[PDB]
Structures are given as structure tokens and as C-alpha cells.
Amino acid sequence: GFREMPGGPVWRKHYITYRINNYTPDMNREDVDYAIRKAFQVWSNVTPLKFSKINTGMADILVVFARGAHGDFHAFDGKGGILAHAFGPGSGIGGDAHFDEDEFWTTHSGGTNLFLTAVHEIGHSLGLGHSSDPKAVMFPTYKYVDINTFRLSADDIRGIQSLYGD
Numbered sequence: 001g002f003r004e005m006p007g008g009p010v011w012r013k014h015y016i017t018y019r020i021n022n023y024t025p026d027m028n029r030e031d032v033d034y035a036i037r038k039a040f041q042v043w044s045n046v047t048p049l050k051f052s053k054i055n056t057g058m059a060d061i062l063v064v065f066a067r068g069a070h071g072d073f074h075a076f077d078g079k080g081g082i083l084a085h086a087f088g089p090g091s092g093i094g095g096d097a098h099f100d101e102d103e104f105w106t107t108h109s110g111g112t113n114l115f116l117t118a119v120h121e122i123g124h125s126l127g128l129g130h131s132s133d134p135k136a137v138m139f140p141t142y143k144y145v146d147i148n149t150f151r152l153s154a155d156d157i158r159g160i161q162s163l164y165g166d
């Protein structure tokens with residue numbers, strides 16, 4: 001059972017921009033770009049949404065790696081516990097995705113997988129809440145799965161399209 005964030009916030013545009021505010025030292029700069037790019041694509045593939053990376057200017061979605069208290073009244077808790085959090089569509093912090101820098105970000109499973117976490121986070125950026133369906137990416141539980149073969153569950157697609165269709 002997919003859920004939509006309270007209020008049902010959605011982007012009213014299809015051309016959405018994102019920008020990587022900073023890079024975690026755990027991964028190689030380009031692996032980070034790859035992870036996020038691929039994470040956005042997971043959602044582009046099933047909706048009329050198009051995501052474009054920018055390096056300067058104000059992006060709709062800001063991606064940032066932060067530790068503890070980082071200026072949004074949603075403090076991280078050190079390694080473990082909270083992995084990341086994002087905000088529903090809207091201007092300002094809206095759509096932004098934060099990743100706890102106290103976690104160890106990896107391209108695979110050596111620690112916390114950026115890509116997978118990012119897919120789940122971007123789901124929030126777009127207006128999706130937590131799903132009760134345990135096999136949905138929007139399920140509140142982190143669980144590493146093969147990345148090279150990853151695929152959105154029927155629940156996720158059904159939920160994301162109930163907001164933007166396709």
C-alpha cells in the first residue's frame with residue numbers, strides 16, 4: 001500500500017532540476033553523480049517527469065551530505081539509525097534530499113548504498129510517502145538488493161503515477 005505525503009504535494013512542472021550541493025568523501029565524485037543520475041532515472045522512466053542536473057544556480061532539488069544538526073531542524077544521529085531524509089515538492093527546502101554523512105556511502109554494499117537510498121529519497125522529493133508494501137522501494141526499511149538488476153515494484157509505479165500518471 002503506497003502512501004502519498006500528507007496534503008498531496010506534487011511538482012506542477014515536468015522539467016525539474018537538481019544540484020549536488022557537496023560530495024561525500026566516502027565515494028568517488030563520479031560514482032556519486034552516477035548513483036544520483038540513475039536514481040532520478042528510475043522515476044523518469046515511469047512518469048512524464050524529466051530531471052536535469054545543474055552545477056550553478058538554484059535547482060528544484062538540492063542533494064546534500066550532512067552530519068548531525070545541519071540547518072533544517074531535522075538533525076542526523078551519527079552512524080546508524082537515520083540514513084537520510086528528504087522533503088516533499090515545494091520551493092525552498094522542498095524536494096531537497098539529505099544524506100547522513102556519518103553513514104558510510106558505497107557504490108555497492110560495503111556500507112549504506114547511495115543509489116538505493118537515493119531512489120527512496122527522491123520518492124519523497126516527488127511526493128510519495130511510506131508504503132506498507134514490503135517489496136516497494138518506498139517501504140520504510142533499508143535493505144540492500146542487487147543494484148544492476150534493481151526495478152521499481154508495481155506498488156511504487158502505481159503510486160508515483162497516481163500523482164503524475166504517464
Ligand SMILES: COc1ccc(S(=O)(=O)N(Cc2cccnc2)[C@@H](C(=O)NO)C(C)C)cc1
Nearest residue numbers: 081082083084085086116117120121140141142
Ligand atoms: C531504502 O531507502 C531508505 C532510506 C532511508 C531509511 S531510514 O531508515 O533512514 N528512515 C526510515 C525509517 C525506518 C524505521 C523507523 N523509522 C524510519 C528515514 C526515512 O524514511 N528516510 O527517507 C526516517 C528516519 C526519516 C530507510 C530506507
Ligand SMILES: [Ca+2]
Nearest residue numbers: 078080082100
Ligand atoms: Ca545516522
Ligand SMILES: [Ca+2]
Nearest residue numbers: 060092093094
Ligand atoms: Ca528545493
Ligand SMILES: [Ca+2]
Nearest residue numbers: 101102103104
Ligand atoms: Ca560518510
Ligand SMILES: [Zn+2]
Nearest residue numbers: 070072074098
Ligand atoms: Zn536535513
Ligand SMILES: [Zn+2]
Nearest residue numbers: 120124130140
Ligand atoms: Zn523515507
